[PDB]
């Protein structure tokens, strides 16, 4: 399997199944729902066993950000390859389970690979009258739903949908998290801009855990930087990128999940969403150092 190339959804699913079959005592596949076009929403669960808290990690909520899905897939392989050898991932997995959703919007991903390379949204049909397709799945969460930075126009790239959790992909994630009940970190991957962010996107005020989330984000950005010299900027969503009501980490934080972070991966605009395949591996490797720093902090600070 070549982790340094973009793959079709069929290729991704096969590799997820190959991972499970070659590491049965550590990885399992959990289906949490289905897409609008009825494709299975499969999460990989990494666990050493026992009733324990968990970290949620997702990628590809926006179809066109192909470096995210590729990074999530390489990350799955990196956990299984390093478990038992690297002391840090080994001790992380003694304390916590990791849930990883590589392709959060499978319908959009396939549409972007076959018809439109810039597609962002889901592929649901609009309940109007509308002639436009799809909802922005990162404006559909119940956290300042409908506010600034989200549109009521179905033809917009930031359309919020008719109501919070209208998209089955999003409702499938919310239902899993609420049923699980012990999720302690929520991390979502987007591309581009090179930013490591924490709540609020729906408002520009400081959240209660500002000082701790800022320090954790700065430490992760530091660790990321050390491999290839790539520099990230850190801050709340609202001030470092833009206001964006109805986002996932605003929902997770307000639900009580304190370590809620968002990455904008590589690049800063030279290639944008069309990141060369030659940059997949360098992007995934350095992102792993940032991810590991955040998970170490979750491991060391139970709540």
């Amino acid at each position: 399997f070549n982790f340094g190339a973009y793959h079709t959804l069929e290729e991704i699913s096969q590799e997820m199944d190959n991972l499970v079959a070659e590491h049965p005592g550590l990885v399992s596949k959990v289906n949490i729902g289905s897409s609008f076009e009825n494709r299975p929403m499969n999460v990989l669960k990494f666990s050493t066993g026992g009733d324990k808290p968990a970290i949620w990690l997702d990628a590809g909520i926006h179809a066109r950000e192909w470096v995210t899905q590729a990074t999530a897939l390489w990350t799955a392989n990196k956990i299984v390859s390093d478990y038992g050898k690297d002391p840090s991932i080994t001790s992380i997995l003694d304390a916590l389970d990791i849930f990883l959703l590589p392709v959060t919007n499978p319908d959009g991903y396939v549409f972007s690979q076959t018809k439109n390379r810039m597609w962002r949204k889901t592929r649901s049909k609009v309940s109007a009258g509308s002639l436009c397709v799809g909802v922005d799945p990162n404006r559909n969460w119940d956290a300042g739903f409908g506010g600034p930075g989200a549109s009521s126009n179905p033809c917009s790239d930031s359309y919020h949908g008719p109501s919070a959790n209208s998209e089955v992909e999003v409702k499938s994630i919310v239902d899993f998290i609420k049923s699980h009940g012990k999720v302690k970190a929520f991390i979502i991957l987007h591309s581009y801009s090179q930013l490591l962010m924490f709540p609020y996107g729906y408002k520009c005020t400081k959240l209660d855990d500002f000082d701790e989330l800022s320090e954790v984000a700065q430490k992760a950005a530091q660790s990321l930087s050390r491999l290839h010299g790539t520099k990230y900027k850190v801050g709340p969503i609202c001030s470092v990128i833009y206001q964006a009501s109805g986002g996932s980490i605003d929902w997770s934080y307000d639900y009580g999940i304190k370590y809620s972070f968002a990455f904008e991966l590589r690049d800063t605009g030279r290639y944008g969403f069309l990141l060369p395949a030659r940059q997949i591996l360098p992007t995934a490797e350095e992102t792993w150092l940032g991810l590991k720093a955040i998970m170490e902090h979750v491991r060391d600070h139970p709540y």
């Binding site: 930031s158 833009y242 206001q243 800063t268």
Partner: protein, 61 residues
């Protein structure tokens, strides 16, 4: 000079202006602190409306 953010169907644009504000054709616009990306790209002063503005845009990311 005041700084603004405008939401459009396919992109987000910031405007840094002196003696003007974005026109209604620029989308849904309100005053907003500048973000990192805005300062980097909005480098040139151009005649805008009744004044002058610097502007740059990014896609929803």
């Amino acid at each position: 000079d005041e700084s603004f953010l405008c939401y459009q169907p396919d992109q987000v644009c910031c405007f840094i202006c002196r003696g003007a504000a974005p026109l209604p054709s620029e989308g849904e616009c309100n005053p907003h602190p500048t973000a990192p990306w805005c300062r980097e790209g909005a480098v040139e002063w151009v005649p805008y409306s009744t004044g002058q503005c610097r502007t740059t845009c990014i896609p929803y990311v």
